[PDB]
Nucleic acid binder design. Structure first.
Ligand SMILES: Nc1ncnc2[nH]cnc12
Ligand SMILES: Nc1ncnc2[nH]cnc12
Lengths: 338, 338
DNA sequence: TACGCAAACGTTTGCGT
DNA sequence: TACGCAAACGTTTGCGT
C-alpha cells in the first residue's frame, strides 16, 4: 500500500517513506503530492511492517493480577497515561495468580515482541520467579516487591513496612491498646509487609495481639466483612482495628454497621491504600495512602530508560506511603495518660 | 532466528514452521529434533513476522473512556477474559472523552492493525461519530449506545431506559411521591436514558419533579456528594432519591450521613449499576443491576463473528437491566394507600 | 513418503548519482 | 539538489519431487 501511495504520487516509496517520517529533506511540491496521495488513498502506515524492520513495537505489556480491584485499577490508569504520552501502546494482561495463565501471557507477550514488561503479580513463588527469568532478555520491572527478589529486573519498592508501622503508631498515639488486624494475604508484600510494619510498633509499645484478633483477608470486601464479624463476634473485643486494604475496610465498615456497632464510636478503624473514593466511605476513611500515580510513572520511567538508554543494570526506586487522617478513628482509653 | 532453528536441526525453515504450527505431517524424529533446537536456542516465534504474512494480529483494541471507574473497570475485566480465552491480545486505550486523544488512539490502533475495535466512549458527538466512520473498514462494535446511531457498526444495547423506569416504579410502589434525582451526564446514554426511563414512570403516576430536585452528576462520587447536599439543603425535601450510578450514590450516602440524615430512615436512596461492591455500601445499596460480564462477552462475540465469519451487516444485541433490592429504601408515606 | 526452494507480506535505509 | 534501486527484516505457503 505504500507502493500504491508512491505511485499515485509518482515518486519512490523511498520518497513516501521519507516524508512520512520526515527522515530526510523533501521538496515541498514533492512532499505535498505524497500527502495528497496519502490522503485520497486513505493510507494507514503499517506498524507491523515497520516494527519488523526497525525492531521495536513501541508497545508495552502489563502482566497484572486483576484489573477490577480499585487499587490496581488506579495504578493501571496511571501506567496507561504514561504510555500514551510517550507513544507506547499498552497490552493489558490479567493472570489472576494462575501460573499457567501466567506462562501463557508471558509468552504471547514475548511473541508480540513488546519493548518492555511491567510485572505486578502480587505473589511470587520460585516457580514464577523462575519463569520471569527466562525472559530476562526482554526489559522489565516488577512494581510490587518488598525488597529486590531478583537481579534480572528493575524494582520499584513501596515501603509497605513503614506504612504498617505508621498505622499502628497512630492507633497507639490515639489511646488505643486493644487493637485487632485483618491483614491481606501473607504471600503478598502489601499483605505480609504491611502487617509486619504493624506488628513492630506493637512490640515497641508492648501491645500484644491476641491471635483471636487477627483475621486474614484477601483484599476483597467480603473478606473484610467476615473478618470484622469474627472479630466483634467475641466476648472480649478490641477498640481499634487495622485493616490491610481500603476495600476490605469497606467490608469491615458494613458488618459493624450491621451488628449495630458505631464507627468510630464503638470501633475505630484504619485502612490502607487510600483508594480514590475512600473519602466517601461512611464514615470518611482514615488510611495510609499509597502513591499510586507515582508508583506507575516511576515504573514506566525505569523501563523506558532500560529500553532507550539500553541499561543493563538492575535498579530500584523507593516510594513512600503517608497517613491520611479522615474520620474513622477516635481517641482510645489511654489518650489522656501519655 | 527461525533460520537458526532450522539449522541446528538441519531441516528447512519450511519444516520448522510446519512443526511449530502443526500445519502438515512431520516425521517424529524430525519433529523432535526441531523441538530440541527450538529449545536450546530458546526460540520465540515472532508474531510480528507472522502477522505480516497471515494478515491478522490476533489483537483487539478497546477504546474506552477511563478504566478507573468501577463500572468500566468491571466491563473491561470481562472483555479481557474473553480475549484471553480465544487467543486475542487486548490493547487498552483511555481517551477521556478528548477528541484529539481519540483521534490519536484510533490511529495508533489502525496502524497496529488490530483485528477489531471495541468502542466505549460514553458521549458521541457528530465529530466523533465522523471519525469512527473513517475506520468502518476495521471491524468494530460500540458497546454503549442507546439505539443504533450508525450503520457501520455492531451495537450492544442496554435498555437503560427500562432501567430508569424500573427504578422510578419501585420508588412509587414503596409509598414515595416526593422523589428527587441526580442524573449522570445527559450527553451520555446511561445518563440521558436512565433519566428519561425514570421521568416516564413519574408522568405515569402524575408525580412531578420540581427542578430544584434534580441535580446533574458526572458519575463521580464527588458529584453525588454535592448533589445530595444541594437536594437536602433545602426547605422542602424529597423522601426518596434516584441516583444515576452507584459510585455517585456512594457520594450521596456520605453527605446524608454528614448532615446527620439517616438512610433509609430519613432518605431512601436507589442507585444504578450494581457495581461489585455496592452490597458493601452502608447501608447495602438497592440498585438496578447492569449485566456487565454479559455486556462484555456479548460485545466480544459480535466482533469475533464479524472478524471470523467475515460479516458485513450491522447487528445489534439487547441486554437487560434488573432491580436488586438491598437495604437503602424504605416504604414511603403512601405505601398503605394503594 | 516426507520434506525443500523461493517468493511474498510492507516497510526502512544504504548507497548511489 | 533532491531523490531511486534493491536488499533486508522473519515469517508462511505454493508447488515441486
Ligand atoms: N493485592 C492487592 N489487591 C487489591 N488491593 C490491594 N492493595 C494492596 N495490595 C492489594
Ligand atoms: N459513564 C459512566 N461512568 C461511570 N459509571 C457509569 N455507569 C454508567 N455510565 C457510567
Amino acid at each position: 500500500t505504500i507502493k500504491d501511495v508512491a505511485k499515485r504520487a509518482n515518486v519512490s516509496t523511498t520518497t513516501v517513506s521519507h516524508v512520512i517520517n520526515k527522515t530526510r529533506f523533501v521538496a515541498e511540491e514533492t512532499r505535498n503530492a505524497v500527502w495528497a496521495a496519502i490522503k485520497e488513498l486513505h493510507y494507514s502506515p503499517s506498524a507491523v511492517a515497520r516494527s519488523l524492520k526497525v525492531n521495536h513495537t513501541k508497545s508495552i505489556g502489563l502482566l497484572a493480577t486483576s484489573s477490577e480491584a480499585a487499587y490496581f485499577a488506579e495504578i493501571i490508569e496511571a501506567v496507561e497515561k504514561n504510555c500514551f504520552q510517550k507513544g507506547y501502546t499498552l497490552i493489558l494482561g490479567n493472570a489472576w495468580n494462575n501460573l499457567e495463565k501466567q506462562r501463557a501471557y508471558l509468552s504471547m507477550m514475548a511473541q508480540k515482541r513488546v519493548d518492555g514488561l511491567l510485572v505486578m503479580c502480587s505473589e511470587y513463588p520460585e516457580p514464577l520467579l523462575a519463569m520471569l527469568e527466562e525472559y530476562r532478555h526482554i526489559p522489565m520491572v516488577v512494581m510490587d516487591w518488598g525488597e529486590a527478589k531478583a537481579d534480572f529486573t528493575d524494582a520499584v519498592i513501596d515501603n509497605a513496612f513503614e506504612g504498617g508501622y505508621m498505622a499502628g503508631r497512630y492507633l497507639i498515639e490515639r489511646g488505643h491498646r486493644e487493637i485487632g488486624v485483618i491483614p491481606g494475604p501473607l504471600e503478598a508484600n502489601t499483605g505480609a509487609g504491611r502487617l509486619a510494619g504493624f506488628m513492630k510498633a506493637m512490640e515497641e509499645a508492648m501491645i500484644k495481639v491476641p491471635e483471636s484478633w487477627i483475621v486474614q483477608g484477601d483484599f476483597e470486601p467480603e473478606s473484610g466483612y467476615r473478618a470484622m464479624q469474627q472479630i466483634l463476634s467475641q466476648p472480649h473485643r478490641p477498640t481499634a482495628v487495622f485493616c490491610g486494604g481500603d476495600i476490605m475496610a469497606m467490608g469491615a465498615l458494613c458488618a459493624a454497621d450491621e451488628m449495630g456497632l458505631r464507627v468510630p464510636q464503638d470501633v475505630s478503624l484504619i485502612g490502607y491504600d487510600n483508594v480514590r473514593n475512600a473519602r466517601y466511605f461512611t464514615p470518611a476513611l482514615t488510611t495510609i495512602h499509597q502513591p499510586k500515580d507515582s508508583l506507575g510513572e516511576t515504573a514506566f520511567n525505569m523501563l523506558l530508560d532500560r529500553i532507550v538508554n539500553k541499561r543493563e543494570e538492575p535498579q530500584s526506586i523507593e516510594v513512600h506511603p503517608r497517613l491520611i487522617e479522615r474520620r474513622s478513628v477516635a481517641d482510645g482509653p489511654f489518650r489522656d495518660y501519655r
